[PDB]
Paper text:
The lasso peptide MS-271 is a ribosomally synthesized and post-translationally modified peptide (RiPP) consisting of 21 amino acids with D-tryptophan at the C-terminus, and is derived from the precursor peptide MslA. [name], encoded in the MS-271 biosynthetic gene cluster (msl), catalyzes the epimerization at the Cα center of the MslA C-terminal Trp21, leading to epi-MslA. The crystal structure analysis, followed by site-directed mutagenesis, docking simulation, and ICP-MS studies demonstrate that [name] employs acid/base chemistry to facilitate the reversible epimerization of the C-terminal Trp21 of MslA, by utilizing two pairs of His/Asp catalytic residues that are electrostatically tethered to a six-coordination motif with a Ca(II) ion via water molecules.
In the mutagenesis studies, all residues except for His295 were substituted with alanine, while His295 was substituted with asparagine, with the same size as histidine, because of the instability of the His295A variant during the purification and enzyme reaction. The in vitro experiment revealed that all variants lacked epimerase activity, indicating that the four residues are crucial for catalysis. In contrast, the loss of catalytic activity of the His295N and Asp11A variants could be due to a structural collapse of the metal-binding and substrate-binding sites, caused by a breakdown of the hydrogen bonding network between six-coordination motif and Asp11/His295 via the w2 water molecule and substrate. Therefore, we evaluated the His295N and Asp11A variants from a structural aspect. We obtained their crystal structures, [name] Asp11A:apo and [name] His295N:apo at 2.41 and 2.55 Å resolutions, respectively. Both crystal structures indicated that the variants retained the same six-coordination motif as that in the wild-type [name] crystal structure. The His295N substitution had no effect on the active center organization, while the Asp11A substitution led to the flexibility of His295 in the [name] Asp11A:apo crystal structure, where a 1:1 alternative state was observed for the His295 residue.
Residue numbers in the entry:
A (entry chain A), B (entry chain A), C (entry chain A): 1 to 208, 211 to 439
The structure:
């Protein structure tokens, strides 16, 4: 009865115009996006007209702020529903995220994942088309503490921010390793410095047999190990809104940002897999992931796709003309630097960071087809971002040529193999997931 | 010489985008509306950008507030002249109705029935087209007391609000029933509590042989009965403006909102029939009614049509994302509710309110043709609103298929039979009124 | 250890300057007020600079709006903490009450009973002095429905308004009287007009053996009677904030507005007595009442005073220069009226309303002395408002002369006798309550 198509993509880090070049492979990507009912991307940049102040985001790679005109490039490329919860949305602070919401609403762009308070950041956004409706929810597990939005109290307003998916890590250690840690705690005098916190709260906050030292949670175990788990509040709250969106839309897509690695950099964190299964358990039709700036595996769970990371769909970090003073300070310089010179010195003249490795310049655009909520097709379109090209040309997306698309499709198939996912391959380098329906 | 077509419709309770789906029956409804000279609907929702505060409208079913973008859906569907006097226009208070007027005027949408003062709410609006002009007046007989607009004094401004059609109800009781009422008044001690109101005003305000007790008017009569009558001020004032509009437009349409039932729910209140006859007596070319959220009869009076209720042309109450705190309090909940969950619990999981009954999901769009003020045709187009479909899909209008349109046309013919109205029926399920001209 | 004095007063209906005349008895009243630690009055007028729109408050006697300069007269007279919850605070709507809050905060005047949302209207205000602190809470049981403030929801803001003390009245009727009421319901056809409300909600909303007809609650009883009861929500919420204020101030005063009469006009409603006992049960040090524009009895409950009504401390209703158009319409006139002529015709040229009766022009200012929360003194100062004087001079307060103060003190003693209250009388006409401490 109802038949809807959804295009998915990863980090859209756009800082320049001319996003879609005159290359036929780039114009064919825009044609692909425009031809779908909904095209989702993750706005990994703060569009700005001047509102806000730069926050110190050194671990995030610096501030990512661009002229608000890049929003026109995003929409003209074909993207129609934006996810905004990520580790850069708060780069201009609470005033910046309020400026972003204003810019998006003035341009008529549906967005989710940020809000004036926590509920607004958690809400889904409903995009209505003549053929049906899509609900988008957006959250992130990577962000500086405090950047999460807050709901109001009877006496104070909330706080603008992002929709959080918090998680805790626990270090499993043997009983002998545990005794050495507490010995180090006592002998270094650190336990003595918690003496008054014991008197104020009534008990040692390091004694939970659990243990909290150096801002890290330790637990006695049979063998050493490492475990992660979602925050129960965030998991239940996000799941709650997913069930709400299922009643009011044909399709529910959950967009999650997560840099956190598993046992190996290409595997997702264990908490992210639990989160993705829960979202589909609550009624989501797809889970699209991003963060690590490279591709990760694709899992089919209860006949619904989980894309743990679609990498970057646009990557123009080194082309931003907005570098904060704290970011400049990370590069020792004998003279004041211009933005382009700053990034050249930051990457060691191109010998480190994202430039030398091909994984940061391959992408994937899935196009899913649903019929009455059932997944009937999941096409895979590999995207090339121009590895090895000059800094001013790399980062713009185009449909990969046959040879490169096959390499990307092989990578995705290999990353998806632990989940039992199979891929059919076309002659042009595109492919599609093998479905059970 | 002059030949004009007017499409009429009922309550437009729009809260979502994609009002006209990709269904050919829905696209053919937009084609029908766009093809007329004037398409009138009743804006039964407050479009908002944030101005105002929710009023407690529990008897009205709750607050009905939507993103102001729904105005674009109304105009793109084909509606061109809006009536705004109804029991929801004041859902965001005087500031909300001032915000609505701003939104409508910024989008170039003609409207009537609300204003900054009582005269502005009473005025007609003149919609001019190359083929002629239509004057629309809009009033409502259902609203919370005080919501009516007010005119200024020499010392104070007026009050923003709606154009009212007030009415009083009188309970006819036998003389023995009357004596019991006054006995109950005296013996319960209620008459004692009016002792000082007697001293301040000079007489008992319950002694009018009329009688006013429990905020109700009682009158001695031969047999028990029930009578209603329009407020003389509102009837003369509205009639006054109708005569004004007749001098300045080719066509004068009066739009009246009224939930009030007659002896049976499908019959209009006796005052509404007197009002409708008066409007045509003063020179109106048509009277379009709405309120009860279902269809009522059609009457031809002095060769002019009276549509006592065209039901809902759009019905998306359960899809609103704006639920006030007082509205939430009507549903006892062990945890905070989302809007969709709140409406599911309010309707008893769909077992009560408007969902179980088909009458709330059938509609009618008449298209009238006038030639020099004379009615020469009155086509009837039954509209389906999707009974039994999921909550996120029902409420959007489309031209009913042959089988359903014939059922709707039978209902209208039956509801119109007490007025002597006859209908010709086409092969597709549409029809037209039998005219005397 | 701590010793604090509190002056109390009733309705302050000020609309003109020169509140304290050059009469030594008036200057001695200001000296009395200025000499206390806290002087409480009820602001029974909307101070305005132009913000808002007049609401239709016919049952309240019309709109009561004045130049905001009257706030300077209130403070210069000696009043220092204002209560604002009453049936006139909303005379200019939600915008007017927001304008009042702005005016009060710009002048540094502590106030309670109105707010931007329901919680702000319920909160106490803390007035701090070098000798200690007083917490004031303000609520009203007389107001037009909907004027109560509202708290926000996750999706909509609250509503500015007043702190409500709602209550329900039940008419006790015999079983035979009950059967006549339902017979009148069925035979008049009124029960037939609820036919669809039965289909929508699932049951007749008039069948609760209780019964709800004509917007009135009826109950079968042994004998006819009349009972009132506080709204459980308002009683528990107000009591909740009283317990909060007790922790943060030396003294807690609850100011309640109530026109509702008991079995006789001088007795308070039964619900008001239950409310007053509860407030002191929760930790309030005094309950000051007002509304009826005349004096009522004084009760000592658990060694804490309850003043059910202190009448008017200022009464200049007929001197307002702001008469709304709806208020003008209550007087049939052959020519447009000026404010003074309008009030002369409204009172029948002075032969009715408040002018002919002395009870509306006598007042009382109690001055309470507390020592560590214990009431050690309660002086009574009768106030004269100028009965029989010209309209432009009556309504301004002054300490009553010996002869008139003794008459007022006799009235208070008589009104307080049913509660077992005794009064000592001084030679000047003032007095004090007989305390058990
Ligand atoms: Ca990131
Ligand atoms: Ca209605
Ligand atoms: Ca009053």
């Amino acid at each position: 009865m109802t038949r809807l198509t959804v295009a998915l993509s990863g980090d859209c880090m756009v800082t320049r115009g001319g996003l879609i070049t005159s290359d036929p492979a780039a114009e064919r990507l825009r044609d692909l996006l425009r031809g779908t009912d909904f095209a989702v991307t993750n706005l990994e940049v703060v569009p700005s007209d001047g509102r806000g102040h730069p926050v110190h985001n050194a671990v995030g790679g610096g501030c990512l702020i661009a002229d608000s005109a890049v929003l026109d490039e995003v929409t003209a490329a074909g993207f129609s529903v934006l996810g905004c919860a990520n580790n850069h949305a708060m780069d201009l602070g609470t005033e910046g995220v309020l400026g972003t919401m204003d810019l998006l609403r003035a341009r008529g762009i549906p967005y989710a994942g940020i809000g004036a308070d926590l509920t607004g950041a958690r809400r889904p956004v409903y995009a209505d088309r003549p053929g049906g409706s899509l609900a988008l929810l957006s959250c992130t597990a990577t962000f500086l503490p405090g950047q999460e939005a807050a709901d109001p109290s009877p006496e104070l307003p909330g706080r603008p921010g992002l929709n959080p998916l918090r998680h805790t890590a626990t270090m499993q250690v043997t009983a002998d390793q545990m005794d050495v840690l507490r010995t180090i705690d006592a002998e270094t005098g650190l336990r003595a410095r918690r003496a008054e916190a014991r008197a104020l709260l009534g008990v040692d906050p390091a004694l939970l047999d659990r243990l909290a030292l150096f801002g890290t949670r330790f637990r006695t175990a049979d063998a050493p190990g490492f475990t992660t788990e979602c925050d129960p509040r965030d998991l239940d709250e996000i799941a709650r809104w997913v069930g709400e969106a299922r009643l009011r839309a044909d399709l529910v897509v959950v967009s999650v940002h997560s840099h956190e690695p598993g046992p190996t950099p290409e595997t997702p964190g264990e908490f992210l897999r639990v989160f993705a299964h829960r979202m589909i358990d609550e009624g989501a039709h797809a889970v699209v992931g991003h963060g690590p700036n490279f591709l990760r595996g694709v899992e089919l769970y209860r006949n619904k796709p989980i894309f743990y990371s679609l990498g970057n769909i646009v990557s123009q970090i080194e082309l931003t003309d907005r570098v904060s003073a704290e970011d400049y300070a990370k590069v020792t310089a004998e003279r004041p630097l211009t933005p382009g010179r700053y990034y050249d010195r930051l990457s060691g003249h191109g010998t480190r960071l994202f430039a030398p490795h091909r994984r940061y310049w391959q992408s994937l655009v899935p196009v899913l087809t649903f019929e009455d909520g059932t997944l009937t097709a999941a096409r895979l379109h590999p995207v090339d971002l121009g590895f090895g090209r000059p800094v001013h040309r790399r980062g713009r997306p185009r449909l990969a040529d046959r040879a490169e698309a096959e390499k990307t499709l092989t990578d995705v198939a290999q990353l998806s193999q632990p989940y039992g996912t199979a891929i059919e391959v076309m002659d042009d380098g595109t492919g599609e997931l093998a479905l059970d329906v």
